[PDB]
Design a protein around this motif. Structure first.
Motif: not given
Ligand SMILES: CC1=CN2CCS(=O)(=O)N=C2C(c2ccc(OC3CCCCC3)cc2)=N1
Ligand SMILES: N[C@@H](CCC(=O)O)C(=O)O
Ligand SMILES: N[C@@H](CCC(=O)O)C(=O)O
Ligand SMILES: [Zn+2]
Lengths: 261, 262
Positions: A96-97, A100, A225, A230, B47, B101, B103, B231-232, B235-236
């Motif tokens: 996921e890094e 997507d 990405k 997406r 985060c 959004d 996760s 957001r990102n 999620n990570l």
């Protein structure tokens, strides 16, 4: 302006399989399975035409520790060889890094496959003995789980697997399953519960899943990405789940398939 | 700009967020305990943000009024800018993912049936084929919407019954649904998420249980307003916490480790 979407996928039962009469069929019609049906539904909901392509190297995807190059379906997305991956591709942090994922369309966990009658009930059991060998697929998420684990039992298992001779690892799921079946109880295979539960219901009905799952995760549809697909793909997965279509397809390809009674 | 405290919206729902016994003598985030309290601390640490836990003003999860188109609950707090993030047992749904959004999911669940022990029901089909045992859902949330929207025969039949049943079969909170099962001598069954069902099955007085398979499969996710800078990273962080075994540890801590039913 609309272009045909190149879908990368993998020959893995019952996700994508060659039809019995495939030599006389062309293009997408050659293939059948859960992910073939899922691709047609995603494409219909998102309004695109597509071409199914089987990943060139036959792998899911891992990053070479030295070169940092990704192989498998992940590499096909990263390097621009495909537009989308529709396959049993596990959602993981390292992936996921770089790509997507949609929300998950299927749940799974790592599990143990034995030949019937093998005296193993758990991962702890495997870790406490040496008569029965055990291993995983190469270049996938299960191998990485073991490589990374700090849980005592799984660390012990990895220490064994990484140095075992002859190699306990396999190039494809089918190779792992064949090795269990031909090993007279002396090989157990670590693989995702989805694949394990499918094979348990196929002739010759000589394997089974033992013990609880080792983890809990999901498969997702992957895009590079910056893909314009997406959001539409993500919302389409959720639409299919809510309409009960994913559950219908799971029943179609697992349990309606069942050959072991 | 300058680093700012992130406002977290959540909901009092056991064992996700609960008031501590001694809460009146504590301040701020220390007033609360539970699975989502522990998860919020970990998300914030991974985060790199400071945060304030707040309980959703209207006590609801989130639905859009058909007439006004206004979102209520935690979803509305994100939509209208009253909170920066929701960390709660908030179901990932299509209509919500269109406006906020989520996760990746941190917990799996499906809709399930809670009965008083000994009730002669094994399935949704069983409920749909009889009339002696009433059944309902939380009056706002994803379970009610599942029934409202279903095209599956058994579920459509159940919705046709529930929407017209009098007195109301719907409840304002999970606790109200559970109490109704417990006091109804077997004549009420409650439709609720498997997570909440499995929690209550391990609480005294140990008089309820989960029956049958789940009716669907989905997840809870951490939600942010569209365009969030969080957001990102959020999620990570969810993926990292699952892979490091933290989510399974927290589920065991708040469900099973001090379960009261042996
Ligand atoms: C079949 C199906 C459909 N959907 C619809 C989209 S969803 O996002 O709501 N989830 C799902 C879902 C699912 C899959 C995997 C999953 O993994 C979690 C497990 C707990 C620990 C962290 C990872 C959680 C839920 N399965
Ligand atoms: N689904 C896995 C492949 C199977 C496995 O590693 O067991 C992946 O995406 O890597
Ligand atoms: N988790 C649900 C609330 C509980 C339910 O509907 O059963 C939601 O997010 O709406
Ligand atoms: Zn469809």
């Amino acid at each position: 302006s609309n272009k045909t979407v190149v879908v990368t996928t993998i020959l893995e039962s019952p996700y994508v399989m060659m039809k019995k009469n495939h030599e006389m069929l062309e293009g997408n019609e050659r293939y059948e399975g859960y992910c073939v049906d899922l691709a047609a539904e995603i494409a219909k909901h998102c309004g695109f035409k597509y071409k199914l392509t089987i990943v060139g190297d036959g792998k899911y995807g891992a990053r070479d520790a030295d070169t940092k190059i990704w192989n498998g379906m992940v590499g096909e997305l990263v390097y621009g060889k495909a537009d989308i991956a529709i396959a049993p591709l596990t959602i993981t942090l390292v992936r996921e890094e770089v790509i997507d994922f949609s929300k998950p369309f299927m749940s799974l966990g790592i599990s143990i496959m034995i030949k019937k009658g093998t005296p193993i009930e758990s991962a702890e059991d495997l870790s406490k003995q040496t008569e029965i060998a055990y291993g995983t697929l190469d270049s996938g998420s299960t191998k990485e789980f073991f490589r990374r684990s700090k849980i005592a039992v799984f660390d012990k298992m990895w220490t064994y697997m990484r140095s075992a001779e002859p190699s306990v690892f396999v190039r494809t799921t089918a190779e792992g399953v064949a090795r269990v079946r031909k090993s007279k109880g002396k090989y157990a295979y670590l693989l995702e519960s989805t694949m394990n539960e499918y094979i348990e219901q196929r002739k010759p009905c000589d394997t089974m899943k033992v013990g609880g799952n080792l983890d809990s995760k999901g498969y997702g549809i992957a895009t590079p990405k910056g893909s314009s697909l997406r959001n539409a793909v993500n919302l389409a997965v959720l639409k299919l789940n809510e309409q009960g279509l994913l559950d219908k397809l799971k029943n179609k390809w697992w349990y309606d398939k069942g050959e072991c009674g």
